[PDB]
């Protein structure tokens, strides 16, 4: 049995911004998957020994989202509450540049995100050092597609 | 099985994983 904690970034279908409200903690067992009930216990560096834990609920709706089928997954309009907008995964910045003024300090050029593209996975094959309203975020080689197709 | 490939498109990126006894 396995425990996972998840982080997300809002994805923009055009002008408006959307974000998927998947559960914060999802527990897997290889053959079985279920949401972590409460996670009201300390996580030691040695591993996971929850002093107060019990059996977890089952739900085919939300669980199937994590099974790879995003058609019937969580969905939430986040225009009012922007929330997370850029994350660093695999050393490749994941940002929703359609609503954040992301820039590259290698040349000062603005990165253009078009409605046909939802998320831009900026890598070092086009931006060695990136700078979103801050300081040097050194990005390594590519590990992700440059963007995600709308369809 | 969490297909990490499809969750990444909608922005869901795994940030930590472990096991419990």
């Amino acid at each position, epitope marked *: 049995v*396995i425990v*996972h904690r998840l982080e997300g970034v809002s994805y923009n279908i055009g002008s408006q911004e959307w974000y998927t409200t998947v559960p914060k903690y999802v527990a*897997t067992q290889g053959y079985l998957i279920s949401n972590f009930d409460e996670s009201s216990c300390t996580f030691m*560096p*040695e*591993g996971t020994v929850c002093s107060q834990n019990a059996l977890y609920p089952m739900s085919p709706l939300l669980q199937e989202c994590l099974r790879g089928s995003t058609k019937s997954c969580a969905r939430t309009l986040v225009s009012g509450s922007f929330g997370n907008r850029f994350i660093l*995964s*695999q*050393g490749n910045l994941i940002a929703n540049c359609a609503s954040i003024l992301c820039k590259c300090y290698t040349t000062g050029t603005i990165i253009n995100q078009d409605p046909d593209k939802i998320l831009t996975y900026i890598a*070092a*094959d086009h931006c*060695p050092v990136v700078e979103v309203n801050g300081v040097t975020i050194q990005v*390594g*080689s*590519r*590990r*992700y597609p440059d963007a995600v197709y709308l369809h | *099985q*969490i297909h*990490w*490939g499809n969750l*990444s498109k909608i922005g869901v990126v*795994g940030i*930590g*994983s*472990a*096991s419990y006894k």
Partner: antibody
Amino acid sequence: DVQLQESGPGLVKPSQSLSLTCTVSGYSITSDYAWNWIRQFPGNKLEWMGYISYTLTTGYNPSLKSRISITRDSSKNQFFLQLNSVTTEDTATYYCARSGWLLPYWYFDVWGAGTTVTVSS
Amino acid sequence: DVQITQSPSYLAASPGETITINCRASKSISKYLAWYQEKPGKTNELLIYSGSTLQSGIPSRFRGSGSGTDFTLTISSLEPEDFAMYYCQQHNEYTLTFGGGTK
């Protein structure tokens, strides 16, 4: 920076399991990426065996799948290999490499120095 | 059933000229091919990953190319320290297949 220096017993006897330990130093193994074991046979031919992602998902080479397994550790920044039912032609040099967990873009960036595993009398 | 065949198993060289190494497949793998340089007594260093991208810190001499099934590898202005074994690896599907050596 990130370095990988593996070690293990290279004098395994035929028809018993082997053991290989890779000590990832300079970067945590549970943060991200995927960790791999690659071996090259005598003859410079390389083969890919299996991966341990940052999460606890794991797949192996279909040829070796029935007798291979990948583990890890958290307090110690290491991930191991237990391959049982060793036959005559499992002798090779086993390498430690780091790659992304997404397919495609599965290329190996940092490699290990390598160690020699022999299967003989 | 992806099998990668690297044709030039041996190639001579001299300091100051260009040499082309090739690799071939049997099923289309797009532009996804990588090139690793193995100096003796050191760790393998990737040079070109998917497409023809220079890895950060790798000299501009090495130049990837190719698409679909047949790729190449071009080295310009061979310095006396550029002699090692160059392998190619396809990273589009599983059963990740490498290639033969080169000198």
